[PDB]
Design a protein around this ligand. Structure first.
Ligand SMILES: O=C(c1ccc(-n2nnc3cccnc32)cc1)N(c1ncccc1Cl)[C@@H]1CCCNC1
Ligand SMILES: [Mg+2]
Ligand SMILES: [Mg+2]
Ligand SMILES: [Mg+2]
Ligand SMILES: [Mg+2]
Ligand SMILES: [Mg+2]
Ligand SMILES: [Mg+2]
Ligand SMILES: [Mg+2]
Ligand SMILES: [Mg+2]
Ligand SMILES: [Mg+2]
Ligand SMILES: [Mg+2]
Ligand SMILES: [Mg+2]
Ligand SMILES: [Mg+2]
Ligand SMILES: [Mg+2]
Ligand SMILES: [Mg+2]
Ligand SMILES: [Mg+2]
Ligand SMILES: [Mg+2]
Ligand SMILES: [Mg+2]
Ligand SMILES: [Mg+2]
Ligand SMILES: [Mg+2]
Ligand SMILES: [Mg+2]
Ligand SMILES: [Mg+2]
Ligand SMILES: [Mg+2]
Ligand SMILES: [Mg+2]
Ligand SMILES: [Mg+2]
Ligand SMILES: [Mg+2]
Ligand SMILES: [Mg+2]
Ligand SMILES: [Mg+2]
Ligand SMILES: [Mg+2]
Ligand SMILES: [Mg+2]
Ligand SMILES: [Mg+2]
Ligand SMILES: [Mg+2]
Ligand SMILES: [Mg+2]
Ligand SMILES: [Mg+2]
Ligand SMILES: [Mg+2]
Ligand SMILES: [Mg+2]
Ligand SMILES: [Mg+2]
Ligand SMILES: [Mg+2]
Ligand SMILES: [Mg+2]
Ligand SMILES: [Mg+2]
Ligand SMILES: [Mg+2]
Ligand SMILES: [Mg+2]
Ligand SMILES: [Mg+2]
Ligand SMILES: [Mg+2]
Ligand SMILES: [Mg+2]
Ligand SMILES: [Mg+2]
Length: 62
RNA sequence: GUCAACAAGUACCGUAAGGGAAAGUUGAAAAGAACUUUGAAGAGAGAGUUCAAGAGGGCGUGAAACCGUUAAGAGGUAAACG
RNA sequence: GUGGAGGUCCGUAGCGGUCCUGACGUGCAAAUCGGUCGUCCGACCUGGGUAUAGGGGCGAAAGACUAAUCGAACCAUCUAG
RNA sequence: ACGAGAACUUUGAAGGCCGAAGUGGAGAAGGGUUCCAUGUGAACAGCAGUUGAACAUGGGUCAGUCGGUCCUGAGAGAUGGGCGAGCGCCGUUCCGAAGGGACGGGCGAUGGCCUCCGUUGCCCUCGGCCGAUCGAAAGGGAGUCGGGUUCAGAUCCCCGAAUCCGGAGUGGCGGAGAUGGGCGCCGCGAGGCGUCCAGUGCGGUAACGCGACCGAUCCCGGAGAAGCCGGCGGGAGCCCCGGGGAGAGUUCUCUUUUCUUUGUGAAGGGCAGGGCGCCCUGGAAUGGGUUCGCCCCGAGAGAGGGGCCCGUGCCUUGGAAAGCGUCGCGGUUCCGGCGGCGUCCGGUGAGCUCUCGCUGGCCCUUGAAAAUCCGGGGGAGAGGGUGUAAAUCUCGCGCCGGGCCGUACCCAUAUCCGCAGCAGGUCUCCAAGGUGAACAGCCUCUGGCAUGUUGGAACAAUGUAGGUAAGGGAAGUCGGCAAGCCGGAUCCGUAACUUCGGGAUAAGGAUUGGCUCUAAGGGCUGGGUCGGUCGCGGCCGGCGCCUAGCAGCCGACUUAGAACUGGUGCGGACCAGGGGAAUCCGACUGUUUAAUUAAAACAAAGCAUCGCGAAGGCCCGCGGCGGGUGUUGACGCGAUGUGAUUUCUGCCC
RNA sequence: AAAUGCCUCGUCAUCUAAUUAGUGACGCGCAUGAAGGAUGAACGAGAUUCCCACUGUCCCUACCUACUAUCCAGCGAAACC
RNA sequence: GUUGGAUUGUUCACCCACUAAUAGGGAACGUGAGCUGGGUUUAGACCGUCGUGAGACAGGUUAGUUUUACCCUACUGAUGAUGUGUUGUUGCCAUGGUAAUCCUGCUCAGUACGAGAGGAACCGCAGGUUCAGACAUUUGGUGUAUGUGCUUGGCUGAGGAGC
RNA sequence: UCUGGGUCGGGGUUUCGUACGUAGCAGAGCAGCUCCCUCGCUGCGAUCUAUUGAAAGUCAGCCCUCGACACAAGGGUUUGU
């Protein structure tokens, strides 16, 4: 019943956290997660012919 | 007296080289205390063996230091002594 | 932004041993214990197997260590020096 | 309860501690019977014991597959040789006539199912594991798993599934090799009979596949056989989250509740999944593909299509007959009894621990060897004359064997060492829930234990360990010694100085609870317009514009903001830097007197000098032209001083 | 006037109410000095001086807790003489 | 009675401040099984001077284990012992110990005294210092009454009640 | 003994700060029910308010009880002019 209340947001707080925000969730993992989301929507638009091979490749570097 | 009169180069010690003790005696004969009784037993009390258990299984004799007990005497200049 | 280097830093287990000149000091112990401390990817820590033996060994060097023994180990003898 | 006797034994109940880096479960060393029963109750276990690791009496360790055994490593070590008065010791390929083998060739005596054909003697050919031998219970090293079982043993016994190696003269059976063509009569023909010629397998463009699929001396190769660290990814085990059961717990009220439990070995066969600098088609600039990071491409990208490897996961055989959970019924009541029922369906992840893989980083550091095994190249040779044939077979099945030694238990606040049941020391494997960054500390579950060699009663001094303290705030003291303060995290803000890296968590400040909300951050599905119209579903196409994306379902965790709210409390315990200004010294990290000195000492990088071109330099050695450096060669070895950088290093021979 | 300066508590400045301390200067320096001299970040369980915060370190002691001592049952040493 | 401090290991010294005063000594240079370990101060190390050197320095610097009482006595407390028949109650005092101390203010008096500047004292009163003996109404400390609230992490299915 | 002193209980004192339940048209808000409602009525919800200076403790070394309940002439060892 505390995991039920933590997932609603309670007890999380700024005085209930004791490790650094990078230790609490690594920003490499945030970057690694975000890159995979934005790279597979680009591969999915290319094979669905929304974007061509040229708009894909310039977007892929942004 | 050989370290060793005895289950002695033994037990034990040290990684090893090596080091290295202690310990003899019931009685003539086991006759090594049957039996009864108290105790859970060890231990006792009787009884018995023997010349002897003031010889009872590390037991011949059994000193002293030291200790217990009884008896007698004494005790404020620590005892002791001439 | 990503990336993740370093005899890098705080800090575990380990390894070590600073201070209290704390406890102990006929001890739990012929060197221990408590707290605080040093280091903690490196000249790191460790098991087993090997090599080096006494005026010799081995030493990031204190004359340190070489079986509780070290400015020359231990054992027996010369020796009742 | 037993007992003469209970603070200490055992059983139950409670209350607690270790708290998965255990006070848990197993081992290596080392011990040596301590293991396990029963009995005792003297001694010993520093109180006591009805207890014991004591005493007595018995019992207990089962192997082709687990180790040893085998292999080589650092190294040890004989022989030849050399030295040595000598016991010997030097040396390990060096001052050696160091192969004792081999299919075959051939001469053979011939013993023989003497047709022969296994043996054998010499000859011919062939030939460097060029160093005997030893060295690992953590290296290398074929092949065993599940279930049951004892007072004490089990991967060893039993039951059941396997499996490697070795062998089989009298070959044990299949299959492969290997049974085709041409011609000529005959057969209406399907097929016979004759004759001639083949036949040491076949498929795929390819990578490669197929059950076998000749072949020696020799030769080339592979496996064995390789560091550390980082980052991802796959798979498992555990954890977790929804449900479905079976059984317990609570039930004063609430709780569709809380807990426990909810299997499939090896070896086969298949299929997911993972990897591939593997193949083929084709030819890329408006460069494209792509990872967290990279990286890749005319020496062939993207895209299509294949191939191989791994497959520890899932399915199947094993296999439910076993096990487990419940519920019952019996006796031989000390039976691997008997029966029912079940052993289900999902979801998550920067989780943890193993493992597999990919790809990087670092190195004046490049991270064993060998037994063993395999593949290829080569072709000496061998096989039979068209037969239900031969040599041969790394294919399937069958048959026989696997000896010797270890195997109990302890593995440590009581089995080991420390004179002892000694707070010391002593190498590893597994590792749950909560909090949290965390194998931190704290609390709990599994498992374990009885407070560490005595109890009782008191609450004096002095201690030892821990706390607090008005008002001052180092005045104490040789010295702020000791203690205290500080502390996490978020948001701000950070000087001098500097080798530009640092200083730095500088310093300094704010914030932190609970509750109720709010935003933001993803994943899987379906965008199909008219039946044009019959094999309530499709068969080929008129018939249409999601195209600024909708719609359904599902899913974690985290960040920011706001309202309310409390006696201003909020990192509430635990965890958890006091800071500043200077001077001296050593650059730093590292090291050091085990048991009074951790430092400014030693080390060190950098700098500088010296010797030496091998009959050499330095050094060992009783001795040998014996050793070490040296598997070396001046960018090297050897001998010294100083001690990073910066800046300098004067004069005297 | 340095970890090197006898004289020496050197002289002047600063720091304090007060400084044989510390820092900055000065220097015929008892007896500084160049592979060692002079520096300089970072680092240090190294030595030293002051400031801020903090405090029983003190003025000046007090009180509370655990284990002792203390008493009892059991057990029972040694140094020394 | 003879103090609180800076520097120094200091004894001494010197200075600041207070005070009625900040006198001098002794007791195994009183006192370490009382402490501390700052000076000296074994083994480490650095510098200067000396020495060919190992080393030395009555020179500077830094680091460096402080053991035992349970015996007899003394001392401090605690029982007790000998007498008087036993036993109790109420008392006496031999002897030994002995403790209080100093200063301000007011007043005297701005008087005596003195040219002036300055400037007392006794009586009296009001307080304080140092010491001594107590005590806890009060204020302060303590606080495990484990009193009563609050609160973190965990645990009993939650609530409640608790650990 | 005009008993007695104990153990509970009661009262006084005092310490802390308002218990549990229940109720509330108190509550930041959120979720629901719509024949309802004519702006409802069920939930969730820290906190608040009333019941409530409540609740809990209070001699063990606090005070006073005369309520309840028991128990108390019982033992053991010595002492003579
Ligand atoms: O334990 C002792 C200890 C003390 C005294 C003796 N003595 N002295 N005289 C003695 C006469 C007879 C017997 N013993 C005797 C023995 C040893 N320590 C110790 N203390 C100081 C110097 C040396 C040592 Cl070793 C240790 C060190 C570690 C920390 N704890 C203390
Ligand atoms: Mg006689
Ligand atoms: Mg006689
Ligand atoms: Mg005789
Ligand atoms: Mg005799
Ligand atoms: Mg005679
Ligand atoms: Mg006799
Ligand atoms: Mg007498
Ligand atoms: Mg000490
Ligand atoms: Mg002591
Ligand atoms: Mg102990
Ligand atoms: Mg020396
Ligand atoms: Mg000598
Ligand atoms: Mg003589
Ligand atoms: Mg604990
Ligand atoms: Mg075990
Ligand atoms: Mg164990
Ligand atoms: Mg005993
Ligand atoms: Mg046993
Ligand atoms: Mg061998
Ligand atoms: Mg075993
Ligand atoms: Mg023990
Ligand atoms: Mg205890
Ligand atoms: Mg106990
Ligand atoms: Mg205070
Ligand atoms: Mg001072
Ligand atoms: Mg002072
Ligand atoms: Mg300190
Ligand atoms: Mg700084
Ligand atoms: Mg250093
Ligand atoms: Mg030492
Ligand atoms: Mg030390
Ligand atoms: Mg030189
Ligand atoms: Mg000359
Ligand atoms: Mg200077
Ligand atoms: Mg000072
Ligand atoms: Mg100066
Ligand atoms: Mg000179
Ligand atoms: Mg020069
Ligand atoms: Mg003395
Ligand atoms: Mg002393
Ligand atoms: Mg000293
Ligand atoms: Mg010295
Ligand atoms: Mg010099
Ligand atoms: Mg000289
Ligand atoms: Mg509650």
């Amino acid at each position: 019943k505390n995991t039920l209340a933590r997932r609603k947001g309670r007890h999380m707080g700024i005085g209930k956290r004791k490790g650094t925000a990078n230790a609490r969730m690594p920003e490499k993992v945030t970057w690694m997660r975000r890159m995979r989301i934005l790279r597979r929507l680009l591969r999915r638009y290319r094979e669905s012919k929304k974007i061509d091979r040229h708009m894909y490749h310039s977007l892929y570097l942004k």
